[PDB]
Symmetry: D2
Subunit: 331 residues, 4 copies
Amino acid sequence: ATLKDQLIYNLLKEEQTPQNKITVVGVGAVGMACAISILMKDLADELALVDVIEDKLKGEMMDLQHGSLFLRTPKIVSGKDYNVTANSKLVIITAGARQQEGESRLNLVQRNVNIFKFIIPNVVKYSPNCKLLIVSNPVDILTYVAWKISGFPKNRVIGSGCNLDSARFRYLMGERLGVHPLSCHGWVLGEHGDSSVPVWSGMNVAGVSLKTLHPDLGTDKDKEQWKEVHKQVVESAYEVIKLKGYTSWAIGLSVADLAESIMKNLRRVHPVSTMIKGLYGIKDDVFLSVPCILGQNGISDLVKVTLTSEEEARLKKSADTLWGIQKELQF
Amino acid sequence: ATLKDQLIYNLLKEEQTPQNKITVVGVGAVGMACAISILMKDLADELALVDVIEDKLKGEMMDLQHGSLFLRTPKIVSGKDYNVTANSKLVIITAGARQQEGESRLNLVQRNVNIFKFIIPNVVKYSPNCKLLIVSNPVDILTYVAWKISGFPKNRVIGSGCNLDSARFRYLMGERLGVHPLSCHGWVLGEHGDSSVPVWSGMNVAGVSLKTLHPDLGTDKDKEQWKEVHKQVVESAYEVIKLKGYTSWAIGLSVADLAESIMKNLRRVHPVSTMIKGLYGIKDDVFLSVPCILGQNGISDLVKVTLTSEEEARLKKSADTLWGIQKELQF
Amino acid sequence: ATLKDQLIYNLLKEEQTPQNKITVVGVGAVGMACAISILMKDLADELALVDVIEDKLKGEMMDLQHGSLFLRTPKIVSGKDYNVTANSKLVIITAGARQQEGESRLNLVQRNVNIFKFIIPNVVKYSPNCKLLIVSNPVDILTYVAWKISGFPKNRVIGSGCNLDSARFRYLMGERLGVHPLSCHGWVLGEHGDSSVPVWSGMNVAGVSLKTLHPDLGTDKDKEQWKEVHKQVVESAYEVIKLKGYTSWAIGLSVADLAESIMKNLRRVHPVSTMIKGLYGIKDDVFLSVPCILGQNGISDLVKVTLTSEEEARLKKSADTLWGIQKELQF
Amino acid sequence: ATLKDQLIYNLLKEEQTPQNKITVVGVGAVGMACAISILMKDLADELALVDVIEDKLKGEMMDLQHGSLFLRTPKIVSGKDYNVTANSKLVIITAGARQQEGESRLNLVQRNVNIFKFIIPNVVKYSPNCKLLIVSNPVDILTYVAWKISGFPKNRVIGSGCNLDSARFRYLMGERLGVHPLSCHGWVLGEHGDSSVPVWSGMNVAGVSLKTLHPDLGTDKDKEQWKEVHKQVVESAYEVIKLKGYTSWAIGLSVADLAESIMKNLRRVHPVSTMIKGLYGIKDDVFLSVPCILGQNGISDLVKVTLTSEEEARLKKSADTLWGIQKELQF
């Protein structure tokens, strides 16, 4: 008899079905940051990695596996075939084309659509009940694309949206005030990136309205120039990209935070990208970041934030731009 | 009055001395894996990053800072000047030279020595009471170098040594037996890399000696070829390097495990590289991996593993090789 | 419209089926220690508490609920009706009768049987696929009882058995050696309590056999009297009971450790009580503690520990005693 | 040579100085709930327990020690002599007299003063640099007493105050709205207990003011009777006490949350009891709960919450009552 059979008496042939499985698609810096963050928060009993570059994929998988002693996620697998993703509760999509210099936004989105036309039906085939969390940029449009291709109901297709931007906002707020960002409250909503909307009316510490204490907050008459905070939020990513080449750690952490609300059914509120038609005067199928209640069924509820006519106007303009692109897309 | 002063009443101007500070030197893939692993285990109240490449350094720092909302380490700093490292309890060195094409080993090692002649006195100046953890390769030699340059007592200079190799060994063992590596015990000792020694006599599950059940275990007559496991331990790292270009996650996790024993004064036993002269038959000032008890004073105690004459012979040969290299070095 | 409906837009009416639910039966000190340990390790998305004393039950539930802000288990429920336990993955039984003055052991055990005849079919009705973890004393016998009543296969009925005794053993060993118990290995097997068997041959640090270094280890000629360690393992529990009235924290922590292996499918090895007929020379349907691999299907595999004829004799004597009691029982 | 000395080579005689030590005074249900919560959050490298009932104290200590394998706090000690508390960073006081039926508030406070006159100088003697966290009831007065006796500056004497009441408020808010309490914001301030002040103006989700959406919020004209939420907060403890005899778990969790901000220097904002003279028109040395920034030096800063004249009036009346008692105290 083998050493194993001398040492160990087997009771069960186990038809291994994963109970809390997560898949990350794309093993670039973003995908791997998501993976390590997920592994270190014990959110999954099985982690699957998928990418088209087989050697890099295998290398990342093995590197993680070699750290198993220090983790509590007993199964880490990878493959270019989507059968490795079967029965995932949550599938995180980070794959996508990188925008070349002089490439139009439309062209970039169409390249990503061509990628998603392959990824999404494969994901859906093997995990028809999963939640989709889209991290790939441009996230609002790509969440829309994932939604269109998957045929999933809207509660189950979520874009990372302005979750990280809101985290950055709160970090900068905390630095200005000398308070941990957990205790600084403020929301960045709408379209991820330059057009996002900082909701000044909601910024507070301990329930104290900053806008109330300082009525010129976020305006051009503001002597403390709080507008810059938002400008910094918008530009931070660029700066990080200018400095180290890309951004990864912060995105990975924010994505793991989302994953945690979903996998643990927390019903926390996160600013994520969701199908917003019928709100704020928006009449098209577009996805924008609003505060959403996240749980085991994805987005169950939305918070209705009261906005100024100017803030609503920004949202509508974003919706118009997004739709102007989306209607050109070939599925 | 400013918004801050309308919102916040200050009681104290605080000369904040960090109480649980860790420094990582080198922000390549290894250093950043160490940093993220440390941040996600809440081991430090302040993390300092140091490197000579300033833009990359700043970018990595900012990327981590942007995730502050999701972390419990309130201060992350960086700089090329070592004054940012002041008052660290633990300093982790991952920096080192990369071997150029056609450069001899002695030359490469000498370049690392010259680098350490700058790094180490700077580290010691600002944190004279710290523990030094050397991760840079070749790790046994560079740990010797750090020890010589720092003038620290030997309990406070630790090389990562065979900690990860032992973790890999336990992973592979776990895969062969169908058991989590936490419950599979086995030690890889001696010189990190090709010359390491798998201590077959200690391999066990639930205290059951595998060698006793299978006396040919690890020999050439072993029909199950357990030798291959050790071979894979040695080679897997090369494989990962061939597949993805480098290794990072597993080393980061194992280093964070070491850091955890040190920062929490756990007195767990880890196979790390220590100045082993006067034990195990070793007669030169060399560092080799043995099981060490790690706590807040670094290595306070060593486990004396009973070895066969053949295992002892391998350790002595490693010591002779290491000393043969070290005596060529100029300090 | 209500405030909620002005604030929140609902997308979904959710039939929420909990995905990682745990039930604790009995809210005495042991049950509540288990509950708090489970809540602080984030093992469950729903925790159900059950007991016959309704006011105490409700109070404990509310007290836990009031700490929800500090926890990551979004649903805590309680009730005397077992419908609150529906769809549990793991059900932990701590309930049992207390021996009255002048009541025989057989009588006490029979009362526990009669209690289990109510509890177990109710548990099974609402969670037919759960794992049962029996903590109630006398644990080997009551685990047998739960197994008989439930009709579950043996992989799914687990007694806490000698898990805590082994933890205590490793603590005492750690105290003697100056090493954390995580790095001190030793197994207490067989019948929980006075008759348990310390397996001296497996006691080790870093794979170094203590028995090999010290052949008299655990015998009567042992000048260091390591036997006393086992004695203390047996007696410490009495001592704690004499000192504070009962024991709770350590058992709660050890049970949460078991739960963690089960809920996360870890396949770690734990010394738990399992139906051991056909192994270790045992010929009756009795439960004894051996090292078991624990995962999502309960006990999937057992480690076959090499024992001396004397150790085997002790196990057989325990089996005969247990069967001698069990055959008097009426189901 | 002993087995230990054969197995282990000692490098260091360690003058053991704790780096992150916490003391809990009082091992009643509250003290032990604090202790288990602290142990499970890895906030201390050493935990000291102190109480006057020696057998109960020893029993609790041993019970915790037996769970060491499952914890990462390597030293747990206890004693009636305060020398066991030496060099604590944080000392949590839960000891105190229990109010008898018909005992006046003044008489109860004086009994507690007599207890504190023994406890506090002993604590201060052995840990002159510690932060004091007073949990004993009535907490506002006893924090004042601890402050007077210790001679500590006010940043270093903190009362648990309305931290738990605010947590309960947020729990109830979450239940009314279907949102996790982490995402529900609301503050209970002032005097702990019936006279506490729910700050309706600050209640919000995602920065959306509930008071703005529902102007009658918290008034007698409120058709949804949100006032009841506060009444429930006030009464919850009584109910829990009526049901199970006392309250423990929630307090333990909230206290551990405070301890975490202090031990990790987080600078989070918590509603804790602090010396409030010179604010809200208060002219006496009284302690009330306001939002405080908590870190390694205790309370470094206060948030200035804008209150209505009615809310201020409630605070002033509380201050008057507290002072009316405090001026009768004999030190």
